[PDB]
């Protein structure tokens, strides 16, 4: 429909911890925007099943965060593996953005990309090698004019779709607040 090699793929993952070699992906969500950050379509929001032995690696932060959000219950009830989650997400993305064109977009998105390289390389390969990291702009704004940052706030629920929507909203805020293009 609005298929374009200028469209942006936004992605957020939730994990059982910070180490891709030890931990697992338990949620993924994607959004496609056009190049002007208008949201065109939201992709599959997938709680990925993991056995208790993997959930049992979670520290207190992860356990309390992902239990209180309802994600742990959704993970336990899920019948979707990483491979099926890749299949669903690729089938969505192919309708909106060509392979290899969009940088990976999000907040500190290098961390998600590490988990994609390790656990979902077929999905990682769909992105261009570059990164659109909204937190790059956050950090530059904090140093150049930190008063700007008091004008925007995040809920930070660690529900993957809500958090990637907040990533887009943050960049929209920066477009008006710190950019002149």
Q: Which is nearer to Na ion, 12 or 170 (CB)?
A: 12
Catalytic hit among 126, 129, 131, 174: 129
Residue nearest to Na ion (CB): 12
We find the least distance from the C-beta atom of residue 159 to Na ion, in angstroms, to be 11
We find the least distance from the C-beta atom of residue 112 to Na ion, in angstroms, to be 6
Q: Are strands 46-47 and 131-133 parallel, antiparallel or unpaired?
A: unpaired
Q: Which is nearer to Na ion, 27 or 82 (CB)?
A: 27
Residues 1-40 that bind Na ion (CB under 5 A): 12
We find the least distance from the C-beta atom of residue 5 to Na ion, in angstroms, to be 25
> Rounded CA gap, 3 and 25, in Å?
28
Name every residue whose Cβ is closer than 8 Å to that of residue 71 and which is 6 or more positions away in sequence: 14, 26, 27, 47, 158, 159
* 14, 25 contact by CB (below 8 A): yes
The answer to whether residue 174 is catalytic is no
- Residue by residue, DSSP assigns 23-48 as --EEEEEEEEE-TT--EEEE---EEP
**Site residue total, Na ion (CB under 5 A):** 1
Could you list the residues that contact Na ion (CB under 5 A)? 12
Just list the catalytic residues: 129
């Amino acid at each position: 429909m609005s298929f374009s090699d200028q469209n942006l793929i936004w992605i957020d993952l939730e994990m059982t911890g910070l180490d891709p070699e030890m931990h697992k992906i338990i949620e993924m969500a994607t959004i496609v925007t056009d190049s002007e950050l208008n949201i065109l379509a939201e992709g599959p929001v997938i709680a990925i099943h993991q056995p208790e032995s993997e959930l049992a690696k979670m520290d207190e932060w992860c356990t309390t965060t992902h239990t209180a959000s309802g994600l742990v219950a959704r993970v336990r009830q899920s019948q979707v593996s990483e491979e099926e989650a890749i299949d669903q997400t690729l089938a969505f993305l192919k309708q909106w953005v060509p392979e290899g064109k969009s940088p990976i977009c999000g907040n500190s998105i290098g961390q998600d990309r590490r988990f994609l390289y390790k656990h979902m390389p077929r999905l990682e390969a769909y992105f261009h090698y570059r990164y659109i990291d909204v937190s790059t702009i956050k950090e530059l704004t904090r140093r150049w004019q930190p008063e700007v940052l008091k004008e925007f706030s995040k809920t930070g629920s660690h529900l993957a779709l809500d958090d990637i929507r907040e990533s887009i909203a943050e960049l929209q805020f920066y477009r008006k607040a710190v950019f002149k293009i």
